[PDB]
Design a protein around this motif. Structure first.
Motif, PDB file in Angstrom:
ATOM      1  N   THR A   1      23.491 -15.054   8.870  1.00 54.16           N
ATOM      2  CA  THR A   1      22.575 -15.335   9.986  1.00 54.16           C
ATOM      3  C   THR A   1      23.461 -15.594  11.203  1.00 54.16           C
ATOM      4  OG1 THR A   1      20.606 -16.190   8.813  1.00 54.16           O
ATOM      5  CG2 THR A   1      21.055 -17.046  11.015  1.00 54.16           C
ATOM      6  N   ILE A   2      23.507 -14.611  12.096  1.00 51.75           N
ATOM      7  CA  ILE A   2      24.361 -14.660  13.278  1.00 51.75           C
ATOM      8  C   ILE A   2      24.378 -15.926  14.123  1.00 51.75           C
ATOM      9  CG2 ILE A   2      25.030 -13.479  15.429  1.00 51.75           C
ATOM     10  CD1 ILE A   2      24.058 -10.908  14.250  1.00 51.75           C
TER      11      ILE A   2
ATOM     12  N   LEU B   1      20.941  -6.026  16.366  1.00 53.61           N
ATOM     13  CA  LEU B   1      21.724  -7.205  16.013  1.00 53.61           C
ATOM     14  C   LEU B   1      22.084  -8.096  17.203  1.00 53.61           C
ATOM     15  CD1 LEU B   1      24.314  -5.216  13.844  1.00 53.61           C
ATOM     16  CD2 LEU B   1      22.262  -6.315  12.959  1.00 53.61           C
ATOM     17  N   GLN B   2      21.563  -9.321  17.189  1.00 51.42           N
ATOM     18  CA  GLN B   2      21.820 -10.320  18.230  1.00 51.42           C
ATOM     19  C   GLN B   2      21.741 -11.667  17.517  1.00 51.42           C
ATOM     20  OE1 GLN B   2      18.104  -9.752  20.741  1.00 51.42           O
ATOM     21  NE2 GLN B   2      17.607 -11.819  20.006  1.00 51.42           N
TER      22      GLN B   2
ATOM     23  N   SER C   1      19.968 -13.055  14.182  1.00 48.57           N
ATOM     24  CA  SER C   1      19.693 -11.891  13.338  1.00 48.57           C
ATOM     25  C   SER C   1      20.174 -12.146  11.903  1.00 48.57           C
ATOM     26  CB  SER C   1      20.398 -10.640  13.891  1.00 48.57           C
ATOM     27  OG  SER C   1      19.882 -10.248  15.157  1.00 48.57           O
ATOM     28  N   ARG C   2      19.317 -11.822  10.936  1.00 49.60           N
ATOM     29  CA  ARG C   2      19.629 -11.994   9.521  1.00 49.60           C
ATOM     30  C   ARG C   2      20.044 -10.674   8.867  1.00 49.60           C
ATOM     31  NH1 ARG C   2      18.990 -15.534   5.699  1.00 49.60           N
ATOM     32  NH2 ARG C   2      18.024 -17.589   5.966  1.00 49.60           N
ATOM     33  N   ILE C   3      21.348 -10.461   8.723  1.00 48.84           N
ATOM     34  CA  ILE C   3      21.868  -9.235   8.112  1.00 48.84           C
ATOM     35  C   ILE C   3      22.202  -9.387   6.611  1.00 48.84           C
ATOM     36  CG2 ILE C   3      22.826  -8.539  10.338  1.00 48.84           C
ATOM     37  CD1 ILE C   3      25.483  -9.525   9.595  1.00 48.84           C
TER      38      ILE C   3
END
Lengths: 95, 95, 95
Positions: free
Chosen positions: C22-23, C1-2, C5-7
């Motif tokens: 989306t971070i 995760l950076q 990144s799409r969580i």
């Protein structure tokens, strides 16, 4: 009025403009045939008396564009559109 | 159109129950522009004598129980303001 | 995760996929400053004691995208979204 003409459909209760109809055609329906095939032909059939004495000479056909929903001031909570009833049935899991 | 009249009606009716004056303060220009019967038009060109707003005055209410503008608010919203005043004075304690 | 990144944001009660975040970043919050100016301070305060004991070391910023409504099975008739309530107040003339 003519093919291509854009007319406004007004409410008689309150002169509200409900939609713009764009004329496809302007034709003379044969009411005798309409009254015969659709409603049975009997001269005393309500729909026929109405078709003979209230309906006008021509029919205007055309796709509709909506500007406003008719205004009703009674029982708004009992008045459902098909979208609303569909959302309702869906929420309660009614299938 | 006249304060003297409205005052009379208010006093006549008060002898038997409550009276509410609702000033539908819609601006004249709005009224004329939306006129779909040509009465303002005829009155403008002398076909009608002393028409209110045109050749006769409208004494604007001063202590109206409720002021509304048909140009700025829909009818259900205006009806509802009226219903709210009635509700708030105990008239509508429903069934 | 950076960043970038799409969580998938998951609902623990039923493992339903709710949102995709989306971070925008993955910083680590001054849980002391926050807890002091934002929640007043005092080491007791419910939010503080939650902040220190339950909140993880870092926060994950990022705008969201809606994938599923989030299933409640109780009192659906009383559950209103801001949209739903706005539509209701509108149908009733409620200002």
């Amino acid at each position: 009025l003519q093919a291509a003409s854009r007319i406004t459909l007004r409410d008689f209760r309150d002169d509200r403009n409900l939609a713009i109809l764009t004329i496809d055609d302007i034709y003379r329906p044969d009411k005798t045939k309409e009254a015969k095939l659709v409603f049975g032909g009997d001269p005393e059939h309500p729909a026929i008396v109405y078709l003979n004495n209230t309906v006008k000479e021509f029919y205007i056909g055309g796709k509709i564009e909506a500007v406003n929903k008719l205004n009703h001031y009674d029982y708004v909570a009992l008045r459902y559109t098909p979208a609303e009833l569909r959302v309702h049935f869906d929420k309660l899991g009614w299938s | 159109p006249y304060e003297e009249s409205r005052k009379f009606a208010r006093d006549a009716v008060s002898q038997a129950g409550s009276f509410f004056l609702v000033h539908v303060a819609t601006p004249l220009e709005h009224c004329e522009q939306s006129d779909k019967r040509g009465i303002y038009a005829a009155a403008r060109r002398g076909e009608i004598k002393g028409f209110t707003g045109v050749d006769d005055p409208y004494e604007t209410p001063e202590k109206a129980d409720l002021v509304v503008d048909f140009s700025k608010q829909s009818v259900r919203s205006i009806v509802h303001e009226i219903i709210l005043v009635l509700e708030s004075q105990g008239f509508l304690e429903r069934q």
